[PDB]
Structures are given as C-alpha cells and as structure tokens.
Design a protein around this ligand. Structure first.
Ligand SMILES: [Mg+2]
Ligand SMILES: [Mg+2]
Ligand SMILES: [Mg+2]
Ligand SMILES: [Mg+2]
Ligand SMILES: [Mg+2]
Ligand SMILES: [Mg+2]
Lengths: 770, 770
DNA sequence: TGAGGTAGTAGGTTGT
DNA sequence: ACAACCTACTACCTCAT
DNA sequence: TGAGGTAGTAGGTTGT
DNA sequence: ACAACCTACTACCTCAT
DNA sequence: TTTTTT
DNA sequence: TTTTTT
C-alpha cells in the first residue's frame, strides 16, 4: 500500500548556492599558532562562513576570503558539485545563517505562539533545532520543536537559607545532583564532593574564602562599574552565613583532577531533575514538553507563515510512504498442545495473549513453549529463594511473599505439568522437561536490610550456605523504592557469583498495581510479564520467527562506558539459522578499548573458537552486521583485512535512533529520504507524543578486501521490521530497535556491571541480563 | 651476630637549621591567578626556598618572606620542631642547595675522577642523586652514583640519509622506539605512528611542510640573530630530501589526542635501547654503568675530599648491622622416600639439589613432592602438545622436539613412578597420584608460523579439535628469538581459553645453553628449572616452610596498568595456615580502579565469599598486609571502616625496592635507619654490581576503627626474610621480595593480559601465571 | 620467552 | 630543578655436584 | 527495579 | 554557536480479552 | 495455600 | 628413544 504524509521539511531556494569556494590548508592548530583559548579549526571555519573538509590535515573550505593571522597555503579552487553530499548540506546550513534563518530567530518566532511557562521554581521555554538534507538535487531544511527547562532560583533561595536544610538537600540527592554556575559567562557545571563511607557533604565555613570567591567573580568577569549594579541586583550582597561547597568539574577536558573548587551556594543553581520536585508539579512540567503531531504541524505552519524571506518556502513538504501490512506482525511460530509447530495465526489468538489459559484453561487455547534448553534434561530440581528488604512494612512483605509463591505454584506449575506430562513423556520416559522451583520449607525467606553492607553480607552468607553442592537457583527480590544504585548492582553481581538468577520487584509496584476486580492481588499484566521474563532468563524461548532470512548469521554490536575508568567495553549478539527458518541467540564479549571503535580483528578471532561450523565451512558464508550508531573508518578498514583472509562476505548497515526527522502520522510505515530509510515500526498507545522513526543508512558490502556501497531495498526494510518483533522481555512489547542491537545493548550494560555466571549457560541462550 | 659497615651517608652540620619559618596559604592555583606556562604551587615554594606542607589546601612553608603577585594570607609562624620528619628532611635538602651542595655541583666534582665515555654513537656520563634522612636528631645526606646515556647523532646521521634505510630502521624497531626533539629547550619525547595491519611507517614527503617546521623551530625558540649561528652549526641547512614522520606525544598530560605532529628526522634523536645496537658495543656500554662497592666507596670518598665547605662532613658514615644466620635459609620441609616430613637439613643436601637424583639415583637422596593437588585424585590422564615456530631451522626443531620428549619421559616419569608406586599405593589402591603426560602419537606436533594471525588461528583450531571432551592439557612451545609481543600474549591467552597450560622456550636458549660434556644436550640447570616450573604450574608444591607464623593470613597487594585503557587493575595473593606451620597460596582478583589506590571495602567483600572459615569465625583473626609501595591515605581510611564491622585486627607494612641507600658490603644483613629497616636478604653471584636492599617502613596496627603506629622489631624482619625464601619458579633462586608481594605482582600482570583458566584451579593452588 | 640479579630509557600517581 | 615511589620495555651474567 | 514508549539534564567520540 | 551521533540518569503513561 | 510427583 | 602400566 501507499499514502501521502506531511513531514517537517521545507524546501530551500536554489539561489543560496555559492558560486566560488576557496580551499585553504593550515600547518598547525590555530590554538598553538596563536594563543586564544577555545579557538579551534572549526571556529575559524565558522567565522569565515565555511566548513572543515579535512580535520586531520586541517583543510578548510570557505566562501569569503580567509582572514587569518597565521600561516596557511591556498590549495586552489573548487565547485559546489565536487563536494560530498554531507559537506554540501553543512555548507548550505552555514549559508542559511547569513540570511537570518537561524535557530536564534526561528525560536523567537516560535515563542510568539507558545509562551515560556513557569511551574513551581522552573521555567519551560520552547526552541527549535535546524538541519539540512539533500534529497535528490534540492536542499530541505528540517525544523524540530524542543523545550528547555531552567531554574529561576539559586541554591540559597531554595533551602530557605538554613545550612541544615542545605545539608539534607545535598545528602538526599547525592547520586545525581549537579550545580551550574550562572554568575559566570561560561556556565560551567560542577559536581559536589562527599565523604567516603560516612556520606555527608564536604562544607568549609570560613568568611575569608567566601569573600575571596565572591570578589573574584565580580572582578574577573564583570569588570566594569556598570556591571556591578546588575551583579548586586541579581544576587545581592556578600552573604556570610553561607558555607562553601567542595566541588569538582563535571567534565574532564580540563583534566588535572586535583583542581579543587569552592562553590558558594548563592551563585549556582541545580540543573534539572524531576526526582527533586513534587509529583503534582513534575506531572505538569511533563505533558508540556510532549506535543501531538497536530500541534507540531500547526506550530510549524505558523512559523513558516510568519517568515518574510524568499530563501525558504511557505509550506511543509509531503512525502509518499509505503505502509506495512498487518499480516507481517503475525509471523511467529508457537507450539501447540500436542507439540506441533502451528503458526500462531491458526489459533485465533495474538502474541500478547500467550498465557491467558494458565488462569482460565476454558476460554483460550493452551499454548506451549517452542524451545527448552538442553541442560534441563539432566537438571530437574531448582532451589528458589525469596529475599525481602527490611525497609518495607510487614503487610507489604507478606503480600510480596504470597504473590511470589502463588506466581510460582498456580501459574508456572500448571505449565510445567501440562508440558512435561500431557504433551511429553510418551511412555513414562522423556528427556527434556521443565524443572521444579522449590521455595519449600523455611530458611528460604530472607529479610535483611539491603541498603547496607552488613545486610548484603548476611544475605550472601545465607544464600551461599544454602547453595552448597548445587549449580543453579532462582531468587525473587522485593526491594524498597529508594534503593540506591551500586547496591542493586552489588546484589545482582554477588547473586550471579553463586549461579543464582534473580528477579527484582520494587515497592511502588506492589502497592499501586493491584488487580481491577480483586484489589488484594497483583495485576494480570504484571504477573504475566514477570513469568515471561523469568522463563526467558531461564533459557526458554516461547516463540520464534516464521521469517526466512537470506543470511547465515546476524550480528549486532554496541559499546558502553566503563564504571570506574576512562575506557569502553564492546558487546555483541549473534543469531544463527542453520537452515534459515529458526534462530538462536548467543552473546559474545569483546575486550576493552580506548574509544567507540571495535577492533574487528579481535572480534572475529573470538568468534571462531566459540563456533564449530567456522566462518568458512565449505563455501562462502554471508554475514549481516547491524551497527548501533555508525561504522567508523577504523572498523571499515579492519573489515577488509578480515575479508581478505577468512573468505567471507559482510553486509553492514548503520542504525540510528536520535535524529530530528518526524512524520506527522500514527501508523507503521517507511520512506526513503536523502539516501537513508526512515522506518516507523511501532504504534503509540499514549495520547500525547509523536513516534520517533528509525534511520537505516550506509549499507555496504565487503568481500575480497573490497568495499562496494549499495542502496537499501525493500527486502532489507522488511527484514529489519521482522527482527523488530522479536522480544523476550515483554509479551505486549512494541519496540523500535532490532533484536540483535537491542540485546547487544543489554549485554554491554551487563559487562559494564561485571555480571557473568558460568560462561556455559551463555552458549545455550540463557539471557540473565535481559 | 653484629658487624660494622660503611654506608653512603654523610653527616650535616646543625648550623643549617633555619631559625624562623613563615607559613602562607593561597586561595587558588598559581597557574590560574596568573597565567604562566608550567607554574605550580611546588615551583612557587621552590623559588622562595621552601616546601609545600599541604597540597590540597595550598599551604606552604617558607624561609624567606613570600614574594607573590597574587592573593594569599599569612597563617602565622612555626618552628622547625613542629614539622614532621619528612618535611624537616625536605626543608634541609632545600637549604643544602643555597650553600652550593646540589646535584649539579657534586656531579661536576665526580666527573673529575670518572670521565664521560663514548661507545659507538652513545655517551655515558656519571652523575649523583642526593637525599636527606633524619636518623635520630641529626640529618644525613645520601649520595648515590648513577649514569646517563645520551645519543650524539640525530636520526638523519644514523641511517646515512637513505630514506629506505630510514624505513627499515623505523619498521624493525616499531614497538619500543621513541624520538626526543633536541632542537627545543623542553626536550619533548614523541612516538612515531604506524599503519594498522600492514605495519610500515607513516611518512609525508612535502618540501613546504619541512620548511615550515624548520623555520618554526628557528623562530619560536632561538629568536636572536646570534642563536641562529649555533642552530646552523649544530644541524646544518634545511635538508629537503628528508621526509616527515607522523608522530604523537609520548606523554598524556597535554591530552587532546588528535594533535598530530610532524617530526623532521634531522632535529630528533633516539633515546636509548640496547636492542638497536651491536652486541659487542652493548656489552661495553654495560659493565660501565655497574660499579663494585669498593669503586663506589673510593669515588664517594674522593668527592667528599674535594668539597670545600663546613656544611657537610669529610668521611662516610659507619653503621652497626645485625647479620642473618646461615641456619635460617635451611628451614624448608621436604618429604622423603617413605612419605615422611623430614626437614631438608637431615639429608646433607641443599634446596638447589632437589632433583639431582632423577638423573643419577645413586649418589643423591631421592626426594619427593610435599603436596599434590586434590583434583589429581580423579585426573589420571593429561594430553601434551609440542608447538614449534616455523621460523626455526629444521635441526633446531628436531632438537627441541627430542629435548621436550626426553624431559617428559626420562626425568618426569621416573618421579611419577617412584611417587605413585614405590611410596604410595599401599595395597594396589591409593587416591592422590601424579598424572600421565601423553605426547602420544603424531598430530600432537604442530609446526605453524606463530608470528602471523593465520598460523595462530590454525594452531588454535588444531588444539581445540584435539581437546574435545577433555579438561586439562599441557603444551611446550618452542618460539623464535624475535617473536613480537601481543603475539606471545595472544598465544598464551588462546591456549588458556582451552584450559591448556603452556611453557615457552625461545630459540636463543636452544642454541647456546648446551651441556658441558655432551654438547648435543640441554644444560642440566635449564632442564631442572623447566621441570620445576612445569610442576609448580600444575599445582604441585615441592616444599614448604618450617617457620611458625604468628598471624592467621598473609596478604600481598599490587596494582598494574591496563593494556588499552586509562585505568588500573588490583591483584592480591593470600596465604592461609590453619595451624601456623603449613601454607597454601590462592590468588584473588580485585576490581578495576582509576588510580593506584585499592578499594579495601570491595576487597574484603570478595575475600569473604571465597572463604569458608570467615574473617570472624570464633574470635579475633589477625591479618598481615604487606603493600608493594606504600599504603595510601584512602586505603588506610578504608581499613578502619572494615575493622569496625568485621572485627579483625590488621597489621600493615610498606615494602619498597627503589631507594638510593646502599651498604658497601656483600652479605645478608639488616639495619635500622631513620625509623625504617633496610634488609639485604640475598647474595650477588656476579662480579660487578652492588646489592640493593629492601626498605620496610610504616608498620601500623588497625583494630576497632583505630590506628596505632608501631616500630618494626626483630621478629618482623625475620618473618620477612623467611617469606623471601619461598619461590616456586626457580630452585636456585635468591630473590628480594617476599613471596606474597612477588606473586601479587605476577597475578596483576596476568590479569593485565586477561589470562584466566577455570576459576576452580585457582582456588586450590594452580599457579599458571608463575 | 629457564628465572633471578644489576644497569639503562620513557612515563604515571600521591602528597593532604 | 617537586620528592618519593610505582609501571612498561631492553640488554648481559650466574646458577649444583 | 514489569517493560516498552516519549520527554528532559549532563557528558563524551568522530570526522579524515 | 562545530554537526551528528552515542552514553548515563530521572520522571510519567499504557498494556489482552 | 510455608507445594508435587515419582 | 614418536614412552607406561594396568
Ligand atoms: Mg553505541
Ligand atoms: Mg546501546
Ligand atoms: Mg530486567
Ligand atoms: Mg605497585
Ligand atoms: Mg608489582
Ligand atoms: Mg614463566
């Protein structure tokens, strides 16, 4: 099918294209030839109305003649047609500013129809973001409406000038509080310092220090007789009862991490966080930053109407989109009562209703898991523990215990008996069957304070003592609402170290997610999701795709920052076929690295010993590589080297999720724009908000040490959309990313927290990190 | 016993002690109140004849009145007696320079009796290093004679100006070559850039670039008409046939690692490395930097004789040392023919002659291993592989194969049969016994190019295919001389991943270490060492100490850098007793960190689940903690927190191996100086050189959250000396560091290369990283 | 990389 | 010219009867 | 931390 | 005012007959 | 509802 | 000397 939709793009008149472009080459960084801190090769090319076409060799392209006080050589001339499309778009975007078409102007135009509002102590201000895209031979401007939230009160006029209140404020927001200094014209963000173990802030009470810093702020920046008037009006006199906060830089470009700083809690403001604000106010600050497609369309049309210039057009652009058929969603292969491989279509049911029979067994068909792991043939008995945070009230603890026990016995055991016996065990003897989750007897319910080291030590000691001689166990943790991080991660890591798979539920769910009719029971949605997630963590694949993929492997790659270091960690997820029609999932860990660039040589070496069929078994094996972000130049250069030796053919694509392009409709679709493909694979069930598409770009084929660029066809889009529909963490899931990228992200995040179990469950689809 | 020895210390006249010391406090870094190049708080205190007594708060102590162009406050006055001993010593050292007693003067005085020599293209220059120590109430100056090696030829006049020769030089020293720019007055060191995979340098041939850089060097630094004369005399004209080398900073303080640099191979020199120089010249450059104790004594006495000043004395100092008895070395507990526990004393044999019977069995007693791992009760079968680098000649390959097979069968199997049968298997049935190392049949000898990725892949494939269904194997690798790093480590890591323990021998050993009588056999020393190391890697402890230690555990801690990251890795080694008389070794991995400071909270949490007896079983457990280096303030602060909860008592000591203090004698001894203990535990078997002592300092006791400083007694020194004599990597070993620190270093280095086997052999004494 | 020792080259962290 | 210390790498030299 | 979506705050790497 | 993307964290809102 | 089933 | 011993 097809349709016509309106997108937030406006055409650009061709008269803006420059006639003559000069090219210059520098010999040294402008920051060193001269001495002006902050000056870079990009600022020099910006001030001359130009772009940087070679950052390594310092080669820039300019419209005017270069006005530089250093050393350079002119490399000649160039025409607009000899630049690449990206640089053409960047140059056109730069030229749009010289005609008054800038973000500073369009934001002011927008703020005539949407006014900056004030909620509590914060202000929300609309703004726009502008980009340029070359579709075929015409340039289009992309305008995206965003909001910014700022604080109108300093840290002094927030705690009512009581130092103790400042102490509570600093201590209760220890993890994620940052202070921005507004008295400076750089607006640098700092982080407060805290004492180890004992917590508590690090204040210093000394009048001389505060006097020196206040006078330094006056003298260094506002060094005119006039400016001191607004300095005294904005912040007042030199308050002396205010302590000084120990703080460090939030960034690291300056480096030299011995730079102590003293912050006066009178010239700084908190940045923004809804955790430090009342719920009734956070509800209305939100729902103002989210706009329906119609509101965006009317606002953009008004902005275009109130622009007086020939350069840009007066109406938004319309594009032709290709709709996605409904039949594509219903392409999964579940297994029925007997043990067949019936499509889910021929049961008059949808994927969401997959465990409705376990509570009724009279109105909905009985549906059984498609795949069960191999180690469950020998493993038939699994201990289960219930851990409860002592910070909850007794009624909540009893409710959580009862809910966990009922979930295990009433819901899981029915499936465990209908699968193991009714459909399997042909004559008193079968091999693969669902295990048994004990929870039997006392001393398996642990009630310790999970927010302290002593409680965690006691919990670990108890579980380890009970776990002697065993190899796989399950745990249900009922945690409090305010459980700090580095304690959640610690609990999960120390439980994984004993080969115990854990599932955590927080207090707010146990108190506000009660059922519709029976208000003394957990909601059906939550219970079904919990059972599905536990089954997926135990290695059971409840359904598989009915699609037939043309490749032999599908690999997703992602990179995550380290916890306490300056480095990065790579992670990947690999899906095999062995016929095309059925897939498995195995996570692969790539080593540490210095930047966001995966060493493709070490990845394939690690992907050879973890295999049996090799990458060159008998003939050429085709590999599909989806990259979260973009394929860097080093990754592409290192793929030709692998293709030279291993004799494989790689097809690489880039998946992007943060782009300013929007389509003003609510349906699953895709369209081709600027050489890339924008795909909306999901539908929004909430009233307020606009769906964010997925950008597929830069498809290329590498073989025999050669790279050939290609264009994305319809089959690739259909394959990506099909891979989108494979989620093992939620039955009623409508996600955006494809499965390999989605699970590579989670595996990288798990490695960041050093969550490893046995290295042998990973090979058979155990997904503890899901 | 006792003796009197001469140490390189000279007394200092008390008249130098200052009368009045001023104290000042700054408000901001002098690099920011003003704008200089590298001005710091330490340079400011140096130029005012003073020290920095508080770096965090910027509090400095000065002798003169402070002359500063910024903001500061005087904190009052202080007397010399109120400073700590370290700051008193630093102040006295600073005051020694104002009287002409500096390194620049004493080095010039020394260079009258030792002249700077020239070997090949390098120059060796003597110099001195000076320190100050306060022993009881008098200050002593420590003078240490060192040498410096510099290059008198640029990179241009080293390759005879042939660009191809320059390419060969750059490619053959790719790993460890650095270039220092001598045309600059900062003498900054750079590292050349190379192309990935394909290797080869990164040169740029362009006359304009070389002209610009040469003129920039002339203009920026030597900006006087006179200086250009020596610039033209030193380096010559602007040579134009010289390419430009791509290079980056060797350091990282500047950061911003996109700042490429172009180096002219005419203004830079190699720094120094004996790998790039002829062997006959490297032999004579060495043996000139090493001095016997007598030469050092005469040189220092001459230096003191030719000093005209009252400030320092005219003769070296004499100290009273306590000798170490011979009986202490012979305190190991080996096990005899029957299987008893006789001390090695009652056999008329020494530790080195521990396997002389396996070749004679008629002149020396038969000696059996004390301990054998528990996993060998079930394991009775071990595959053995022989891997040979294809870069060796055929005769060397055959010799290596024959030597490995003979080592396994003639030497090991005799022990394996005398232990398993003659002494064990009382009635046809025993449990613990030595396994069998196959090398059975062909297809267990692998000959592939180990310097390339293809050869490593093939080797891994073959070993993994043969290793199917097994759990422990052994490998002997015969590698070439020039085997580059990152290939050795890769081979070891990929072999460990298959649970194969490897031992590597290089080509130079197989060609020059032939036996005395039979020149077609490997030397006895090398063969015995190889067998001992293999046995230790397999978990067999051939001997244990006869000492009785007063503590329950001994823990050694070390920190190592990361390979591709900016971070650090902690490692530790723990020795248990369970009675005080016997010891086991278990390595413990501490997590990643940002600096050289181990998180003591996470270490003890990891040391609880890896235990069974806990740190608080029934009563107080004493822990001894030896730190490689020094205990940082954060580590000490985090130990009181642990002592508060876990109810343990920790005794911490600092072990230092790089200090300028020397004793002019050759015997095992120790003495007390400046509050620290200097211990010489080994004897030098080479003619040239002086033994380097071990500095034990800063003993302290932590319990109930309280820290009490203590003094090192004789029992602590005896314990450290006894722990020194426990090495499992060499039978004829006389090392310096204690065993826990020595093995913590190796475990940290192994973690740096990610060498992990199964996490279950680690807990029971396997030492694959030794 | 037989392993330990004594010699060099370069760089980093801590201090409190 | 900020002291003390760590780390990585390279080279020779000696070991038991 | 039921899991996914849409909204904010801050920071980093790549380009070639 | 260097684009164009990634990461970490926080908050609400909706889900299957 | 602090289990079954064999 | 590209093994035993059971
Ligand atoms: Mg990414
Ligand atoms: Mg990700
Ligand atoms: Mg989860
Ligand atoms: Mg260390
Ligand atoms: Mg070490
Ligand atoms: Mg070794």
């Amino acid at each position: 099918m097809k349709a016509i939709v309106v997108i937030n793009l406006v055409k650009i008149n061709k008269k803006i294209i420059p006639d003559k472009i000069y090219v210059y080459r520098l010999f040294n960084d402008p920051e060193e030839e001269l001495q002006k801190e902050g000056y870079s090769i990009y600022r020099l090319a910006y001030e001359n109305v130009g772009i940087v076409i070679d950052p390594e060799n310092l080669i820039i392209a300019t419209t005017k003649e270069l006005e530089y006080e250093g050393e350079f050589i002119p490399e000649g001339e160039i025409s607009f047609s000899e630049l690449r499309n990206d640089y053409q778009s960047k140059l056109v975007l730069r030229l749009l500013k010289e005609n008054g078409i800038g973000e500073y102007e369009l934001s002011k135009l927008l703020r005539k129809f949407r006014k900056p509002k004030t909620f509590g102590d914060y202000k929300v201000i609309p703004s726009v973001e502008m980009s340029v895209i070359k579709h075929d031979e015409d340039f289009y401007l992309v305008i995206h409406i965003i909001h910014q939230i700022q604080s109108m009160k300093t840290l002094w006029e927030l705690v009512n000038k009581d130092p103790k209140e400042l102490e509570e404020f600093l201590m209760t927001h220890k993890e994620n509080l940052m202070l921005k200094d507004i008295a400076s014209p750089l607006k640098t963000v700092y982080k407060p310092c805290f004492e180890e173990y004992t917590k508590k802030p690090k204040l210093d009470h000394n009048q001389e220090i505060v006097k020196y810093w206040y006078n330094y702020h006056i003298e260094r920046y506002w060094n005119t007789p006039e400016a001191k008037l607004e300095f005294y009006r904005k912040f007042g006199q030199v308050d002396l009862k205010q302590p000084a906060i120990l703080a460090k830089f939030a960034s690291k470009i300056k480096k030299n991490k011995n730079y102590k700083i003293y912050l006066l809690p009178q010239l700084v403001v908190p940045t923004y966080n809804a955790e430090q604000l009342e719920s009734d106010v956070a509800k209305e600050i939100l729902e103002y930053t989210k706009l329906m497609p119609e509101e965006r369309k009317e606002l953009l049309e008004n902005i275009l109407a109130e622009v007086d210039s020939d350069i840009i057009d007066k109406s938004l652009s319309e594009i032709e989109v290709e709709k996605i058929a409904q039949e594509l969603e219903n392409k999964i292969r579940v297994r029925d009562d007997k043990g067949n491989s019936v499509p889910i279509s021929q049961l008059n049911v949808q994927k969401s209703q997959l465990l409705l029979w376990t509570n009724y067994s009279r109105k909905y068909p009985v549906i059984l898991p498609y795949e069960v792991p191999e180690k469950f043939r020998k493993i038939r008995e699994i201990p289960m523990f219930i851990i409860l945070d002592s910070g909850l009230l007794a009624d909540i603890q009893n409710f959580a215990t009862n809910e966990f026990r009922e979930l295990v016995k009433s819901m899981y055991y029915s499936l465990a008996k209908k699968y193991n016996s009714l459909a399997k065990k042909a004559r008193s003897t079968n091999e693969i069957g669902l295990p048994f989750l004990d929870f039997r007897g006392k001393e398996k319910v642990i009630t310790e304070d999970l927010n302290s080291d002593k409680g965690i030590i006691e919990v670990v000691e108890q579980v380890s003592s009970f776990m002697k001689g065993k190899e796989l166990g399950l745990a249900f943790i009922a945690a409090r609402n305010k459980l700090s991080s580095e304690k959640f991660e610690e609990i999960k890591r120390r439980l994984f170290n004993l080969n115990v798979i854990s599932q955590v539920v927080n207090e707010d769910t146990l108190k506000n997610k009660r059922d519709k009719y029976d208000r003394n029971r957990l909601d059906l949605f939550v219970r079904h999701n919990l059972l599905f997630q536990v089954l997926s963590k135990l290695g059971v694949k409840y359904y598989v795709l009915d699609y037939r993929f043309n490749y032999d492997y599908i690999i997703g790659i992602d990179v995550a920052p380290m916890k306490r270091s300056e480095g990065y960690i790579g992670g990947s997820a690999v899906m095999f076929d062995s016929q095309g029609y059925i897939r498995k999932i195995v996570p692969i860990k790539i080593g540490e690295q210095r930047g966001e660039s995966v060493d493709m040589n070490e990845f394939f070496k690690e992907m050879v010993d973890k295999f049996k069929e090799f990458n060159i078994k008998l003939d050429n094996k085709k590999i599909l590589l989806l990259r979260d972000g973009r394929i860097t130049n080093n990754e592409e250069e290192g793929l030709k080297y692998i293709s030279e030796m291993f004799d494989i053919e790689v097809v690489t694509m880039d998946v992007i999720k943060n782009h300013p392009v929007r389509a003003f409709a609510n349906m699953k679709m895709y369209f081709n724009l600027g050489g890339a493909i924008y795909l909306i694979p999901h539908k929004l069930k909430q009233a307020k908000g606009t769906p964010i598409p997925i950008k597929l770009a830069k498809k290329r084929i590498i073989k025999n040490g050669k790279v050939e660029k290609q264009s994305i066809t319809r089959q690739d889009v259909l394959d990506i959309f099909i891979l989108t529909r494979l989620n093992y963490g939620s039955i009623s899931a409508d996600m955006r990313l494809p499965a390999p990228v989605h699970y590579a992200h989670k595996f990288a995040n798990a490695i960041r927290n050093e969550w490893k179990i046995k290295e042998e469950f990973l090979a058979e689809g155990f997904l503890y990190f899901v």
